[PDB]
């Protein structure tokens, strides 16, 4: 329902904690220390399938971002292309409403 997403990411990184990176998102999904993991649809197939498969069995919901790694990186505040990010603490932001189970 016209989910902004931008305000939720900046509020989650300022109040809570956000772990940006393709390889770091797999390590957090392996042990099970993340609330919500967001993956970019324009990222690599092996990166998206490894994070989704490892997050499914551990018990962490995944949200497919409606855009690209360039827009996700520019939106978070980093000049590099972000393929995947692991949200450990939501805090004040309503990031769990975008794809945190229904």
PDB file of N, CA and C in Angstrom:
ATOM      1  N   UNK A   1       0.826  -1.245   0.000  1.00  0.00           N
ATOM      2  CA  UNK A   1       0.000   0.000   0.000  1.00  0.00           C
ATOM      3  C   UNK A   1       0.842   1.269   0.000  1.00  0.00           C
ATOM      4  N   UNK A   2       1.486   1.573  -1.161  1.00  0.00           N
ATOM      5  CA  UNK A   2       2.356   2.764  -1.339  1.00  0.00           C
ATOM      6  C   UNK A   2       3.456   2.860  -0.248  1.00  0.00           C
ATOM      7  N   UNK A   3       4.075   1.700   0.077  1.00  0.00           N
ATOM      8  CA  UNK A   3       5.144   1.623   1.097  1.00  0.00           C
ATOM      9  C   UNK A   3       6.350   2.502   0.693  1.00  0.00           C
ATOM     10  N   UNK A   4       6.644   3.548   1.508  1.00  0.00           N
ATOM     11  CA  UNK A   4       7.753   4.488   1.226  1.00  0.00           C
ATOM     12  C   UNK A   4       9.112   3.768   1.199  1.00  0.00           C
ATOM     13  N   UNK A   5       9.413   2.950   2.254  1.00  0.00           N
ATOM     14  CA  UNK A   5      10.680   2.171   2.382  1.00  0.00           C
ATOM     15  C   UNK A   5      11.913   3.064   2.728  1.00  0.00           C
ATOM     16  N   UNK A   6      12.098   4.207   2.011  1.00  0.00           N
ATOM     17  CA  UNK A   6      13.232   5.144   2.231  1.00  0.00           C
ATOM     18  C   UNK A   6      13.302   5.660   3.689  1.00  0.00           C
ATOM     19  N   UNK A   7      12.151   6.170   4.209  1.00  0.00           N
ATOM     20  CA  UNK A   7      12.043   6.677   5.602  1.00  0.00           C
ATOM     21  C   UNK A   7      12.326   5.550   6.628  1.00  0.00           C
ATOM     22  N   UNK A   8      11.835   4.317   6.331  1.00  0.00           N
ATOM     23  CA  UNK A   8      12.045   3.132   7.195  1.00  0.00           C
ATOM     24  C   UNK A   8      13.543   2.735   7.263  1.00  0.00           C
ATOM     25  N   UNK A   9      14.279   2.812   6.113  1.00  0.00           N
ATOM     26  CA  UNK A   9      15.727   2.466   6.078  1.00  0.00           C
ATOM     27  C   UNK A   9      16.571   3.492   6.865  1.00  0.00           C
ATOM     28  N   UNK A  10      16.350   4.818   6.621  1.00  0.00           N
ATOM     29  CA  UNK A  10      17.113   5.879   7.343  1.00  0.00           C
ATOM     30  C   UNK A  10      16.796   5.880   8.859  1.00  0.00           C
ATOM     31  N   UNK A  11      15.512   5.614   9.227  1.00  0.00           N
ATOM     32  CA  UNK A  11      15.087   5.532  10.650  1.00  0.00           C
ATOM     33  C   UNK A  11      15.679   4.265  11.326  1.00  0.00           C
ATOM     34  N   UNK A  12      15.750   3.128  10.572  1.00  0.00           N
ATOM     35  CA  UNK A  12      16.314   1.851  11.085  1.00  0.00           C
ATOM     36  C   UNK A  12      17.846   1.933  11.291  1.00  0.00           C
ATOM     37  N   UNK A  13      18.561   2.652  10.385  1.00  0.00           N
ATOM     38  CA  UNK A  13      20.038   2.817  10.469  1.00  0.00           C
ATOM     39  C   UNK A  13      20.449   3.842  11.560  1.00  0.00           C
ATOM     40  N   UNK A  14      19.613   4.888  11.782  1.00  0.00           N
ATOM     41  CA  UNK A  14      19.889   5.941  12.790  1.00  0.00           C
ATOM     42  C   UNK A  14      19.526   5.478  14.226  1.00  0.00           C
ATOM     43  N   UNK A  15      18.310   4.897  14.407  1.00  0.00           N
ATOM     44  CA  UNK A  15      17.832   4.423  15.729  1.00  0.00           C
ATOM     45  C   UNK A  15      18.333   2.993  16.046  1.00  0.00           C
ATOM     46  N   UNK A  16      18.070   2.027  15.130  1.00  0.00           N
ATOM     47  CA  UNK A  16      18.479   0.631  15.326  1.00  0.00           C
ATOM     48  C   UNK A  16      19.856   0.314  14.739  1.00  0.00           C
ATOM     49  N   UNK A  17      19.965  -0.822  14.001  1.00  0.00           N
ATOM     50  CA  UNK A  17      21.239  -1.256  13.380  1.00  0.00           C
ATOM     51  C   UNK A  17      20.998  -1.932  12.010  1.00  0.00           C
ATOM     52  N   UNK A  18      21.832  -1.574  11.001  1.00  0.00           N
ATOM     53  CA  UNK A  18      21.740  -2.138   9.632  1.00  0.00           C
ATOM     54  C   UNK A  18      23.132  -2.639   9.184  1.00  0.00           C
ATOM     55  N   UNK A  19      23.206  -3.920   8.748  1.00  0.00           N
ATOM     56  CA  UNK A  19      24.464  -4.537   8.273  1.00  0.00           C
ATOM     57  C   UNK A  19      24.410  -4.662   6.733  1.00  0.00           C
ATOM     58  N   UNK A  20      24.995  -3.667   6.023  1.00  0.00           N
ATOM     59  CA  UNK A  20      25.007  -3.644   4.541  1.00  0.00           C
ATOM     60  C   UNK A  20      26.170  -4.487   3.967  1.00  0.00           C
ATOM     61  N   UNK A  21      25.845  -5.369   2.991  1.00  0.00           N
ATOM     62  CA  UNK A  21      26.841  -6.241   2.356  1.00  0.00           C
ATOM     63  C   UNK A  21      26.247  -7.585   1.922  1.00  0.00           C
ATOM     64  N   UNK A  22      26.719  -8.125   0.772  1.00  0.00           N
ATOM     65  CA  UNK A  22      26.233  -9.423   0.235  1.00  0.00           C
ATOM     66  C   UNK A  22      26.755 -10.620   1.058  1.00  0.00           C
ATOM     67  N   UNK A  23      28.079 -10.625   1.351  1.00  0.00           N
ATOM     68  CA  UNK A  23      28.733 -11.705   2.128  1.00  0.00           C
ATOM     69  C   UNK A  23      28.351 -11.659   3.629  1.00  0.00           C
ATOM     70  N   UNK A  24      28.189 -10.433   4.200  1.00  0.00           N
ATOM     71  CA  UNK A  24      27.807 -10.258   5.628  1.00  0.00           C
ATOM     72  C   UNK A  24      26.351 -10.718   5.894  1.00  0.00           C
ATOM     73  N   UNK A  25      25.444 -10.565   4.887  1.00  0.00           N
ATOM     74  CA  UNK A  25      24.025 -11.000   5.012  1.00  0.00           C
ATOM     75  C   UNK A  25      23.905 -12.542   5.143  1.00  0.00           C
ATOM     76  N   UNK A  26      24.845 -13.301   4.508  1.00  0.00           N
ATOM     77  CA  UNK A  26      24.868 -14.788   4.573  1.00  0.00           C
ATOM     78  C   UNK A  26      25.357 -15.255   5.973  1.00  0.00           C
ATOM     79  N   UNK A  27      26.412 -14.583   6.519  1.00  0.00           N
ATOM     80  CA  UNK A  27      26.980 -14.910   7.858  1.00  0.00           C
ATOM     81  C   UNK A  27      25.935 -14.720   8.986  1.00  0.00           C
ATOM     82  N   UNK A  28      25.131 -13.626   8.911  1.00  0.00           N
ATOM     83  CA  UNK A  28      24.065 -13.344   9.909  1.00  0.00           C
ATOM     84  C   UNK A  28      22.894 -14.351   9.768  1.00  0.00           C
ATOM     85  N   UNK A  29      22.617 -14.817   8.518  1.00  0.00           N
ATOM     86  CA  UNK A  29      21.557 -15.819   8.251  1.00  0.00           C
ATOM     87  C   UNK A  29      21.981 -17.236   8.722  1.00  0.00           C
ATOM     88  N   UNK A  30      23.314 -17.541   8.669  1.00  0.00           N
ATOM     89  CA  UNK A  30      23.871 -18.857   9.097  1.00  0.00           C
ATOM     90  C   UNK A  30      23.648 -19.114  10.610  1.00  0.00           C
ATOM     91  N   UNK A  31      24.084 -18.153  11.466  1.00  0.00           N
ATOM     92  CA  UNK A  31      23.955 -18.271  12.943  1.00  0.00           C
ATOM     93  C   UNK A  31      22.534 -17.930  13.451  1.00  0.00           C
ATOM     94  N   UNK A  32      21.873 -16.917  12.836  1.00  0.00           N
ATOM     95  CA  UNK A  32      20.518 -16.516  13.234  1.00  0.00           C
ATOM     96  C   UNK A  32      20.496 -15.319  14.180  1.00  0.00           C
ATOM     97  N   UNK A  33      21.107 -14.188  13.752  1.00  0.00           N
ATOM     98  CA  UNK A  33      21.144 -12.962  14.565  1.00  0.00           C
ATOM     99  C   UNK A  33      20.613 -11.740  13.817  1.00  0.00           C
ATOM    100  N   UNK A  34      19.502 -11.916  13.057  1.00  0.00           N
ATOM    101  CA  UNK A  34      18.878 -10.827  12.278  1.00  0.00           C
ATOM    102  C   UNK A  34      17.339 -10.898  12.351  1.00  0.00           C
ATOM    103  N   UNK A  35      16.677  -9.716  12.398  1.00  0.00           N
ATOM    104  CA  UNK A  35      15.197  -9.621  12.455  1.00  0.00           C
ATOM    105  C   UNK A  35      14.589  -9.703  11.039  1.00  0.00           C
ATOM    106  N   UNK A  36      15.096  -8.866  10.098  1.00  0.00           N
ATOM    107  CA  UNK A  36      14.605  -8.840   8.697  1.00  0.00           C
ATOM    108  C   UNK A  36      15.776  -8.652   7.717  1.00  0.00           C
ATOM    109  N   UNK A  37      15.849  -9.489   6.652  1.00  0.00           N
ATOM    110  CA  UNK A  37      16.930  -9.377   5.639  1.00  0.00           C
ATOM    111  C   UNK A  37      16.333  -8.929   4.287  1.00  0.00           C
ATOM    112  N   UNK A  38      16.742  -7.733   3.804  1.00  0.00           N
ATOM    113  CA  UNK A  38      16.254  -7.178   2.521  1.00  0.00           C
ATOM    114  C   UNK A  38      17.290  -7.460   1.408  1.00  0.00           C
ATOM    115  N   UNK A  39      16.826  -8.054   0.280  1.00  0.00           N
ATOM    116  CA  UNK A  39      17.698  -8.388  -0.874  1.00  0.00           C
ATOM    117  C   UNK A  39      17.242  -7.642  -2.148  1.00  0.00           C
ATOM    118  N   UNK A  40      18.210  -7.074  -2.912  1.00  0.00           N
ATOM    119  CA  UNK A  40      17.910  -6.342  -4.164  1.00  0.00           C
ATOM    120  C   UNK A  40      17.626  -7.324  -5.320  1.00  0.00           C
ATOM    121  N   UNK A  41      16.502  -7.107  -6.057  1.00  0.00           N
ATOM    122  CA  UNK A  41      16.105  -7.986  -7.197  1.00  0.00           C
ATOM    123  C   UNK A  41      17.134  -7.970  -8.360  1.00  0.00           C
ATOM    124  N   UNK A  42      17.857  -6.832  -8.542  1.00  0.00           N
ATOM    125  CA  UNK A  42      18.879  -6.690  -9.608  1.00  0.00           C
ATOM    126  C   UNK A  42      20.262  -7.294  -9.202  1.00  0.00           C
ATOM    127  N   UNK A  43      20.393  -7.829  -7.950  1.00  0.00           N
ATOM    128  CA  UNK A  43      21.652  -8.448  -7.463  1.00  0.00           C
ATOM    129  C   UNK A  43      21.890  -9.834  -8.117  1.00  0.00           C
ATOM    130  N   UNK A  44      23.062 -10.465  -7.833  1.00  0.00           N
ATOM    131  CA  UNK A  44      23.418 -11.793  -8.404  1.00  0.00           C
ATOM    132  C   UNK A  44      22.445 -12.912  -7.933  1.00  0.00           C
ATOM    133  N   UNK A  45      22.118 -13.942  -8.806  1.00  0.00           N
ATOM    134  CA  UNK A  45      21.205 -15.056  -8.434  1.00  0.00           C
ATOM    135  C   UNK A  45      21.757 -15.943  -7.294  1.00  0.00           C
ATOM    136  N   UNK A  46      23.090 -16.222  -7.307  1.00  0.00           N
ATOM    137  CA  UNK A  46      23.744 -17.050  -6.257  1.00  0.00           C
ATOM    138  C   UNK A  46      23.743 -16.345  -4.872  1.00  0.00           C
ATOM    139  N   UNK A  47      23.811 -14.984  -4.858  1.00  0.00           N
ATOM    140  CA  UNK A  47      23.783 -14.191  -3.601  1.00  0.00           C
ATOM    141  C   UNK A  47      22.351 -14.197  -2.999  1.00  0.00           C
ATOM    142  N   UNK A  48      21.322 -13.952  -3.853  1.00  0.00           N
ATOM    143  CA  UNK A  48      19.898 -13.930  -3.421  1.00  0.00           C
ATOM    144  C   UNK A  48      19.411 -15.327  -2.966  1.00  0.00           C
ATOM    145  N   UNK A  49      19.768 -16.390  -3.732  1.00  0.00           N
ATOM    146  CA  UNK A  49      19.360 -17.783  -3.414  1.00  0.00           C
ATOM    147  C   UNK A  49      20.055 -18.332  -2.143  1.00  0.00           C
ATOM    148  N   UNK A  50      21.345 -17.959  -1.911  1.00  0.00           N
ATOM    149  CA  UNK A  50      22.100 -18.412  -0.713  1.00  0.00           C
ATOM    150  C   UNK A  50      21.540 -17.752   0.573  1.00  0.00           C
ATOM    151  N   UNK A  51      21.299 -16.413   0.533  1.00  0.00           N
ATOM    152  CA  UNK A  51      20.740 -15.666   1.692  1.00  0.00           C
ATOM    153  C   UNK A  51      19.286 -16.124   1.991  1.00  0.00           C
ATOM    154  N   UNK A  52      18.457 -16.322   0.930  1.00  0.00           N
ATOM    155  CA  UNK A  52      17.049 -16.772   1.090  1.00  0.00           C
ATOM    156  C   UNK A  52      16.965 -18.216   1.635  1.00  0.00           C
ATOM    157  N   UNK A  53      17.797 -19.145   1.087  1.00  0.00           N
ATOM    158  CA  UNK A  53      17.822 -20.566   1.531  1.00  0.00           C
ATOM    159  C   UNK A  53      18.316 -20.694   2.993  1.00  0.00           C
ATOM    160  N   UNK A  54      19.414 -19.977   3.336  1.00  0.00           N
ATOM    161  CA  UNK A  54      19.992 -20.000   4.703  1.00  0.00           C
ATOM    162  C   UNK A  54      19.081 -19.276   5.730  1.00  0.00           C
ATOM    163  N   UNK A  55      18.389 -18.187   5.300  1.00  0.00           N
ATOM    164  CA  UNK A  55      17.463 -17.428   6.178  1.00  0.00           C
ATOM    165  C   UNK A  55      16.129 -18.185   6.403  1.00  0.00           C
ATOM    166  N   UNK A  56      15.673 -18.978   5.388  1.00  0.00           N
ATOM    167  CA  UNK A  56      14.407 -19.760   5.474  1.00  0.00           C
ATOM    168  C   UNK A  56      14.452 -20.833   6.595  1.00  0.00           C
ATOM    169  N   UNK A  57      15.524 -21.670   6.605  1.00  0.00           N
ATOM    170  CA  UNK A  57      15.692 -22.758   7.609  1.00  0.00           C
ATOM    171  C   UNK A  57      16.009 -22.234   9.034  1.00  0.00           C
ATOM    172  N   UNK A  58      16.763 -21.109   9.148  1.00  0.00           N
ATOM    173  CA  UNK A  58      17.116 -20.518  10.469  1.00  0.00           C
ATOM    174  C   UNK A  58      15.897 -19.838  11.147  1.00  0.00           C
ATOM    175  N   UNK A  59      15.027 -19.172  10.339  1.00  0.00           N
ATOM    176  CA  UNK A  59      13.823 -18.500  10.858  1.00  0.00           C
ATOM    177  C   UNK A  59      13.886 -16.974  10.782  1.00  0.00           C
ATOM    178  N   UNK A  60      14.395 -16.425   9.648  1.00  0.00           N
ATOM    179  CA  UNK A  60      14.503 -14.962   9.434  1.00  0.00           C
ATOM    180  C   UNK A  60      13.778 -14.582   8.111  1.00  0.00           C
ATOM    181  N   UNK A  61      12.686 -13.729   8.136  1.00  0.00           N
ATOM    182  CA  UNK A  61      11.957 -13.335   6.904  1.00  0.00           C
ATOM    183  C   UNK A  61      12.813 -12.482   5.936  1.00  0.00           C
ATOM    184  N   UNK A  62      12.638 -12.725   4.615  1.00  0.00           N
ATOM    185  CA  UNK A  62      13.373 -11.998   3.558  1.00  0.00           C
ATOM    186  C   UNK A  62      12.404 -11.115   2.758  1.00  0.00           C
ATOM    187  N   UNK A  63      12.839  -9.877   2.432  1.00  0.00           N
ATOM    188  CA  UNK A  63      12.027  -8.937   1.649  1.00  0.00           C
ATOM    189  C   UNK A  63      12.743  -8.570   0.335  1.00  0.00           C
ATOM    190  N   UNK A  64      12.121  -8.938  -0.807  1.00  0.00           N
ATOM    191  CA  UNK A  64      12.663  -8.617  -2.144  1.00  0.00           C
ATOM    192  C   UNK A  64      12.419  -7.121  -2.455  1.00  0.00           C
ATOM    193  N   UNK A  65      13.517  -6.331  -2.517  1.00  0.00           N
ATOM    194  CA  UNK A  65      13.457  -4.875  -2.793  1.00  0.00           C
ATOM    195  C   UNK A  65      12.991  -4.602  -4.242  1.00  0.00           C
ATOM    196  N   UNK A  66      12.000  -3.686  -4.397  1.00  0.00           N
ATOM    197  CA  UNK A  66      11.450  -3.315  -5.721  1.00  0.00           C
ATOM    198  C   UNK A  66      12.294  -2.186  -6.358  1.00  0.00           C
ATOM    199  N   UNK A  67      13.491  -2.557  -6.864  1.00  0.00           N
ATOM    200  CA  UNK A  67      14.396  -1.588  -7.490  1.00  0.00           C
ATOM    201  C   UNK A  67      15.712  -2.209  -7.952  1.00  0.00           C
ATOM    202  N   UNK A  68      16.845  -1.515  -7.691  1.00  0.00           N
ATOM    203  CA  UNK A  68      18.190  -1.994  -8.089  1.00  0.00           C
ATOM    204  C   UNK A  68      19.224  -1.758  -6.966  1.00  0.00           C
ATOM    205  N   UNK A  69      20.412  -2.407  -7.087  1.00  0.00           N
ATOM    206  CA  UNK A  69      21.517  -2.259  -6.100  1.00  0.00           C
ATOM    207  C   UNK A  69      22.069  -0.808  -6.061  1.00  0.00           C
ATOM    208  N   UNK A  70      22.001  -0.083  -7.216  1.00  0.00           N
ATOM    209  CA  UNK A  70      22.454   1.331  -7.315  1.00  0.00           C
ATOM    210  C   UNK A  70      21.513   2.242  -6.483  1.00  0.00           C
ATOM    211  N   UNK A  71      20.173   2.062  -6.654  1.00  0.00           N
ATOM    212  CA  UNK A  71      19.153   2.839  -5.902  1.00  0.00           C
ATOM    213  C   UNK A  71      19.184   2.489  -4.397  1.00  0.00           C
ATOM    214  N   UNK A  72      19.403   1.186  -4.058  1.00  0.00           N
ATOM    215  CA  UNK A  72      19.485   0.730  -2.646  1.00  0.00           C
ATOM    216  C   UNK A  72      20.712   1.352  -1.935  1.00  0.00           C
ATOM    217  N   UNK A  73      21.885   1.366  -2.631  1.00  0.00           N
ATOM    218  CA  UNK A  73      23.113   1.962  -2.083  1.00  0.00           C
ATOM    219  C   UNK A  73      22.994   3.476  -1.896  1.00  0.00           C
ATOM    220  N   UNK A  74      22.496   4.190  -2.944  1.00  0.00           N
ATOM    221  CA  UNK A  74      22.281   5.663  -2.894  1.00  0.00           C
ATOM    222  C   UNK A  74      21.251   6.038  -1.794  1.00  0.00           C
ATOM    223  N   UNK A  75      20.218   5.176  -1.606  1.00  0.00           N
ATOM    224  CA  UNK A  75      19.160   5.387  -0.594  1.00  0.00           C
ATOM    225  C   UNK A  75      19.697   5.215   0.849  1.00  0.00           C
ATOM    226  N   UNK A  76      20.538   4.174   1.083  1.00  0.00           N
ATOM    227  CA  UNK A  76      21.141   3.913   2.420  1.00  0.00           C
ATOM    228  C   UNK A  76      22.160   5.012   2.829  1.00  0.00           C
ATOM    229  N   UNK A  77      22.807   5.666   1.826  1.00  0.00           N
ATOM    230  CA  UNK A  77      23.814   6.709   2.076  1.00  0.00           C
ATOM    231  C   UNK A  77      25.229   6.308   1.628  1.00  0.00           C
ATOM    232  N   UNK A  78      25.406   5.047   1.142  1.00  0.00           N
ATOM    233  CA  UNK A  78      26.708   4.532   0.674  1.00  0.00           C
ATOM    234  C   UNK A  78      26.855   4.754  -0.854  1.00  0.00           C
ATOM    235  N   UNK A  79      28.050   5.215  -1.376  1.00  0.00           N
ATOM    236  CA  UNK A  79      28.244   5.415  -2.833  1.00  0.00           C
ATOM    237  C   UNK A  79      28.464   4.088  -3.623  1.00  0.00           C
ATOM    238  N   UNK A  80      28.587   2.940  -2.900  1.00  0.00           N
ATOM    239  CA  UNK A  80      28.790   1.609  -3.511  1.00  0.00           C
ATOM    240  C   UNK A  80      27.434   0.920  -3.766  1.00  0.00           C
ATOM    241  N   UNK A  81      27.417  -0.075  -4.683  1.00  0.00           N
ATOM    242  CA  UNK A  81      26.186  -0.826  -5.018  1.00  0.00           C
ATOM    243  C   UNK A  81      25.907  -1.917  -3.957  1.00  0.00           C
ATOM    244  N   UNK A  82      24.795  -1.760  -3.193  1.00  0.00           N
ATOM    245  CA  UNK A  82      24.406  -2.725  -2.137  1.00  0.00           C
ATOM    246  C   UNK A  82      23.499  -3.820  -2.740  1.00  0.00           C
ATOM    247  N   UNK A  83      23.951  -5.090  -2.656  1.00  0.00           N
ATOM    248  CA  UNK A  83      23.189  -6.247  -3.171  1.00  0.00           C
ATOM    249  C   UNK A  83      22.195  -6.776  -2.114  1.00  0.00           C
ATOM    250  N   UNK A  84      22.621  -6.811  -0.824  1.00  0.00           N
ATOM    251  CA  UNK A  84      21.776  -7.300   0.287  1.00  0.00           C
ATOM    252  C   UNK A  84      22.153  -6.634   1.628  1.00  0.00           C
ATOM    253  N   UNK A  85      21.151  -6.462   2.526  1.00  0.00           N
ATOM    254  CA  UNK A  85      21.356  -5.850   3.861  1.00  0.00           C
ATOM    255  C   UNK A  85      20.563  -6.619   4.940  1.00  0.00           C
ATOM    256  N   UNK A  86      21.190  -6.843   6.120  1.00  0.00           N
ATOM    257  CA  UNK A  86      20.553  -7.560   7.239  1.00  0.00           C
ATOM    258  C   UNK A  86      20.182  -6.590   8.380  1.00  0.00           C
ATOM    259  N   UNK A  87      18.858  -6.436   8.636  1.00  0.00           N
ATOM    260  CA  UNK A  87      18.335  -5.560   9.707  1.00  0.00           C
ATOM    261  C   UNK A  87      18.300  -6.361  11.029  1.00  0.00           C
ATOM    262  N   UNK A  88      19.232  -6.033  11.958  1.00  0.00           N
ATOM    263  CA  UNK A  88      19.345  -6.718  13.271  1.00  0.00           C
ATOM    264  C   UNK A  88      18.309  -6.161  14.275  1.00  0.00           C
ATOM    265  N   UNK A  89      18.253  -4.814  14.416  1.00  0.00           N
ATOM    266  CA  UNK A  89      17.323  -4.145  15.343  1.00  0.00           C
ATOM    267  C   UNK A  89      16.440  -3.113  14.587  1.00  0.00           C
ATOM    268  N   UNK A  90      15.074  -3.329  14.459  1.00  0.00           N
ATOM    269  CA  UNK A  90      14.176  -2.375  13.756  1.00  0.00           C
ATOM    270  C   UNK A  90      14.049  -1.026  14.506  1.00  0.00           C
ATOM    271  N   UNK A  91      13.815  -1.089  15.846  1.00  0.00           N
ATOM    272  CA  UNK A  91      13.696   0.111  16.680  1.00  0.00           C
ATOM    273  C   UNK A  91      12.385   0.878  16.482  1.00  0.00           C
ATOM    274  N   UNK A  92      12.489   2.146  16.019  1.00  0.00           N
ATOM    275  CA  UNK A  92      11.315   3.025  15.781  1.00  0.00           C
ATOM    276  C   UNK A  92      10.685   2.799  14.383  1.00  0.00           C
ATOM    277  N   UNK A  93      11.524   2.456  13.371  1.00  0.00           N
ATOM    278  CA  UNK A  93      11.067   2.234  11.976  1.00  0.00           C
ATOM    279  C   UNK A  93      10.122   1.019  11.838  1.00  0.00           C
ATOM    280  N   UNK A  94       9.163   1.111  10.882  1.00  0.00           N
ATOM    281  CA  UNK A  94       8.196   0.026  10.595  1.00  0.00           C
ATOM    282  C   UNK A  94       8.694  -0.809   9.387  1.00  0.00           C
ATOM    283  N   UNK A  95       9.940  -1.337   9.495  1.00  0.00           N
ATOM    284  CA  UNK A  95      10.563  -2.150   8.425  1.00  0.00           C
ATOM    285  C   UNK A  95       9.952  -3.580   8.340  1.00  0.00           C
ATOM    286  N   UNK A  96       9.496  -4.133   9.500  1.00  0.00           N
ATOM    287  CA  UNK A  96       8.883  -5.489   9.568  1.00  0.00           C
ATOM    288  C   UNK A  96       7.530  -5.581   8.812  1.00  0.00           C
ATOM    289  N   UNK A  97       6.828  -4.434   8.603  1.00  0.00           N
ATOM    290  CA  UNK A  97       5.530  -4.415   7.878  1.00  0.00           C
ATOM    291  C   UNK A  97       5.695  -4.634   6.347  1.00  0.00           C
ATOM    292  N   UNK A  98       6.906  -4.350   5.788  1.00  0.00           N
ATOM    293  CA  UNK A  98       7.185  -4.516   4.333  1.00  0.00           C
ATOM    294  C   UNK A  98       7.284  -6.002   3.907  1.00  0.00           C
ATOM    295  N   UNK A  99       7.806  -6.875   4.799  1.00  0.00           N
ATOM    296  CA  UNK A  99       7.938  -8.304   4.479  1.00  0.00           C
ATOM    297  C   UNK A  99       8.421  -9.155   5.651  1.00  0.00           C
ATOM    298  N   UNK A 100       7.907  -8.869   6.870  1.00  0.00           N
ATOM    299  CA  UNK A 100       8.269  -9.619   8.072  1.00  0.00           C
ATOM    300  C   UNK A 100       7.178 -10.598   8.465  1.00  0.00           C
ATOM    301  N   UNK A 101       6.834 -11.533   7.533  1.00  0.00           N
ATOM    302  CA  UNK A 101       5.783 -12.559   7.733  1.00  0.00           C
ATOM    303  C   UNK A 101       4.369 -11.932   7.820  1.00  0.00           C
ATOM    304  N   UNK A 102       3.345 -12.693   7.379  1.00  0.00           N
ATOM    305  CA  UNK A 102       1.937 -12.236   7.393  1.00  0.00           C
ATOM    306  C   UNK A 102       0.993 -13.368   7.821  1.00  0.00           C
TER     307      UNK A 102
END
